[PDB]
Amino acid sequence: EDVDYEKESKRRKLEDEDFLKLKALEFSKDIVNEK
Amino acid sequence: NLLTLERDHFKYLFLTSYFDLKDNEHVPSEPMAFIRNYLNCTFDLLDDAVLMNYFNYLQSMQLKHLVGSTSTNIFKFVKPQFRFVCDRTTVDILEFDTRMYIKPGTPVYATNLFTSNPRKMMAFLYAEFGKVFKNKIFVNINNYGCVLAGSAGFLFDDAYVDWNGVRMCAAPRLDNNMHPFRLYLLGEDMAKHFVDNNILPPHPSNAKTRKINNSMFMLKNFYKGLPLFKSKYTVVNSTKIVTRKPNDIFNEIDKELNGNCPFIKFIQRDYIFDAQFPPDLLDLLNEYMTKSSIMKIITKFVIEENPAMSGEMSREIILDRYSVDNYRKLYIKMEITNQFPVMYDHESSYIFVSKDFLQLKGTMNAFYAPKQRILSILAVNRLFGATETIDFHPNLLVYRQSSPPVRLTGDVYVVDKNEKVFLVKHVFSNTVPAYLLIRGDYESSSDLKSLRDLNPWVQNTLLKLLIPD
Amino acid sequence: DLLNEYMTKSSIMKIITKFVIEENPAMSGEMSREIILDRYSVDNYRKLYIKMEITNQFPVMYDHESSYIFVSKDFLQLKGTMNAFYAPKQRILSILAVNRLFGATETIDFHPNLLVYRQSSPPVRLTGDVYVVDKNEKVFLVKHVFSNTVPAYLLIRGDYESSSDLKSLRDLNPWVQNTLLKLLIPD
Amino acid sequence: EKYHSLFKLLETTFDDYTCRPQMTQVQTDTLLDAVRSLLEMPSTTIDLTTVD
Amino acid sequence: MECPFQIQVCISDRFFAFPHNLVEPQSDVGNKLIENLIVYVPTDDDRLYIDKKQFPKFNSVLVYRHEHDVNIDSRSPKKTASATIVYWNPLVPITEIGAGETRVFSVLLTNNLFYCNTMIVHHENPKCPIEFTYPNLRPIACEIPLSHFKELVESNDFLLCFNLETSTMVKILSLKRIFCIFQYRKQPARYVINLPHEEIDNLYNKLNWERTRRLMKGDVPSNCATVNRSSLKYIKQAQSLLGIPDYSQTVVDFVKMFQKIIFPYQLVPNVIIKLNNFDQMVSSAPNKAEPYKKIRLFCKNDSIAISSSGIVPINMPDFSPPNTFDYSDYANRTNINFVTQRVLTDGGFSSGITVTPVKYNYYL
């Protein structure tokens, strides 16, 4: 048993280290203008 | 019959209990046996009334941070036993050192409980806190334990812990404990609830088999456990002194250090301010010492040789305020194997003040002399024995008008190219490193030096002394 | 004593707050201690600290009822008025948007001479909704909010020119409208 | 008392003769200090001669 | 202020960008799921960063700029159940609530939100950006980061503006978002602001109160901040009086270097005491003149503590009124004057000499 959260908190830290990457997909030029 | 002991032996009782005894030989045999029983904690064997009397005697010896007490159950259930308030803690500059946030002025208690190891158990305390309150949001639970807006909370922490001192700066650890971490409690309602809870934790560490004491955790009543060890010194001669006058102490110090020994050791025991004490209790305490306690080495600003004044080594001579307010000067046979309070390596000695050298007000390690109109800074050592100070003023720094063909040798550090201020190395009696401030027309073999390239010790002093204010 | 242990859901109730100017950050975490006061006696009062609670019940109230603000001792309420007050240091008249005054012990009768017609300077400009109380007397009302949280309208009299976006008094709330209707005292 | 001392000194003038009292050196000095204090001046060289 | 029931607030630095995932259709009692969704935003430009298609679980999505009504102000906001409602980085009080618990997401704890049901999901950002000042450049738009984030990722020196008409709250919000997004970068960028800043120092005081409001429930982070103008000029003067190998050396380095001395000399560097002195309030407090705010400082396994007044017993106040007093026969005025005259004659000095006795608190 390890009731505490620090393991998952470290997981969050890793995820936040990844978090910036998604923005490129979020905002880069897009294949088509549907309109 | 219940095991019982006389009032007077409370001396031993407290001694052993509170300061983390190691030796057991020199306590009188029967009281020692009784104490052993008590440490075995078989409460049933001992009279309660004895205990209540002892506690009232402790109320007489009015230790400050005692938790108010009303029942013997303090010995038989988890309870707080000392009381504290959150100090300012209001600084941002350095790291939090995992000193988690507390609301300013939060009241605090220390438990009677110590554990070898966190994280194995605290789920139990979590369940208890779940009892204490039903609805909860966003508890700041952590490794150490419950936190919620500070407020209600608890944590394991080491014994001697300061509250709300602004740092935990690095220092070596001396001591060892089976159960290093006492629990501490935050939020008064928790302690209030525990007045009713009247409980002891389950102890599966011992299979819950009704064991008085447990492999991983242990109650102690008011155990502070400060370091201690027996005096063993080969006493040669002694004297006792009663006074409050500091200048008087310095006069005694001078009188003594007209003796030949280069240096004197001096100590102050730490606990002296804690409460009232029986003089007999002080007498017992004298034969033990605390390795953490503050100690100093001090010497005169040695000038020159009296050829007769030599060979004293056999005498080792030391002083301490064995009493809060009184002192017990001692001569002993010079010895190696005797042991003393721990001091960090390379610690500077102290130089006793000279009766014509004036410590700068609000400073250390620096002084001025009038007869030659000179300012002086110790390279390393720390002033001692001053009673009065002179504040710095720039007018003191009279620059010299001397004829231009000046010359100098050794390191020059320019202080101000404009005000023609400089610093140069010197050694008093070819033995004490120091630096000399100077101002005016002066010259060297070029070789300019940068303020960057110097000891922080002198540097901070200079930084204040410039007084850009 | 017996009656104290029951209560009547119809009874008068109010909440009152300070004119919360500013933040003392330490003034926090009190929530657990709810505070109550009532004249349990016809003429004697019970002050209570209680554990903060949800399920306890209190006299029924219409939705959206406005609590009151305790008087600021540096103002005066206006004679025979709610909803409005005056402050001398800045020579300013004030009317609450929706809130309700409490704790005044004395009022000044309004008189028109209180209304400094500041001759001011040829260039003036103002912004936001403005309501011409009187074209002729150069009287205007302007939206304002103290402490980002205290909606109110500011009366003024003077040059105080504004953006073109002049707005009709017809549009305003009945509460303030009636208050102004009296305070004008076209009498 | 830091008044009474001075007060007494000056009251002796009611004897009106120009005889000059002995300086009780210690107390006179402390008295001068008290004078300085009670005059609150920035230590502007208050002196025996001005007292005289 | 009253905080009405039925709201939850989420703080998260991620909320600097809209969390399109997290929202779910609210339903009233009776499972009356409300696929109508209205959102409010600080400004219509903010609408330009939301995709309707992210919400197949929804079927009806609309948004507006928030507006602070007057006529309908209430401690108890207007009720509605026809639509779920959301607010996102709101600046100003809200007057409408949908069916069920409404949720709102922001980076900034306003006073309005204090006594309210809140969740933070905070974490330590280890890295802090480095502030910079200069009398090579690249611009950054002050209004919006979103069209520039990659550049802030891909450079470490920047300068930032404002339009003169900007609302103060907008300034605060923009700055907060700016720093928050910086705190994930790996290289702490240099940055500067093109502003007179006199009030901006008080804006930093606002930031401090905000961090404290956070700390009321927060991560106890190793946050980075300072008083600027006074502290800055003092530190600059100090370094100039000392060797200046780098005019742009990080300020914290000097503190770090001075750390080496603290324990071995068991005493306080003067720099740290002039700090918490130049500070307006966390200080000797020029706001109030509070010299008694001495620091108590402590170290591992101490039986003792250190202060501006020197050694003290652990967990004790400054000094005991009863004492081994500074018995006044020593430091007697008379003796003091005696010695002072001796000194003066030895020096041949006219003026400017002053002296004082030493004193002790408990330890001596």
UniProtKB/Swiss-Prot annotation, chain A:
Function as written in the Swiss-Prot or TrEMBL entry: Structural protein that plays a role in the packaging of nucleocapsids and in their egress from the nucleus toward the cell periphery.
Entry coiled-coil feature ranges: none
Known partners and oligomeric status: Homodimer. Interacts with host nuclear F-actin.
Compartmental location: Host nucleus; Virion
Covered range of the whole protein: 460 to 494 of 691
Name of the protein in its database record: Capsid-associated protein VP80
Top-level taxonomy: Viruses, Viruses incertae sedis, Naldaviricetes, Lefavirales, Baculoviridae
Swiss-Prot record, chain B:
Keyword terms of this UniProt record: Host cytoplasm, Host nucleus, Virion
Tagged with keyword Transcription regulation: no
Pfam families reported in the protein's UniProt record: Baculo_Y142 (PF04913)
Principal cellular location given in the protein's record: host cell
Protein name, UniProt field: Protein AC142
UniProt-annotated location(s): Host cytoplasm; Host nucleus; Virion
One GO cellular component term: host cell nucleus
Function per UniProt: Required for occlusion-derived virus (ODV) envelopment and subsequent embedding of virions into polyhedra.
Higher taxonomy: Viruses, Viruses incertae sedis, Naldaviricetes, Lefavirales, Baculoviridae
UniProt KW Membrane keyword: no
From Swiss-Prot, chain D:
Family: Belongs to the baculoviridae C42 protein family.
Subunit comment: Forms a complex with proteins E27 and p78/83. The interaction with p78/83 mediates nuclear translocation of P78/83. Interacts with protein Ac102. Interacts with IE0.
UniProt-annotated location(s): Host nucleus; Virion
Function: Plays a role in host nuclear actin polymerization by recruiting p78/73 protein that is capable of activating an actin-related protein 2/3 complex to initiate nuclear actin polymerization.
Annotated protein name in UniProt: Protein C42
Segment of the intact protein contained: 156 to 207 of 361
UniProtKB/Swiss-Prot annotation, chain E:
Record-level GO BP terms: nuclear capsid assembly; transport of viral material towards nucleus
Main location: host cell
Keyword tags: Host cytoplasm, Host nucleus
Membrane found in the keyword field: no
One CC-aspect GO term: host cell nucleus
Subcellular location: Host cytoplasm; Host nucleus
Database matches in Pfam families: AcMNPV_Ac109
InterPro entries according to UniProt: AcMNPV_Orf109
Function text: Plays a role in the transport of the budded virion (BV) to the host nucleus and for occlusion of viral progeny.
Listed name of the protein: Protein AC109
Taxonomic source organism: Autographa californica nuclear polyhedrosis virus
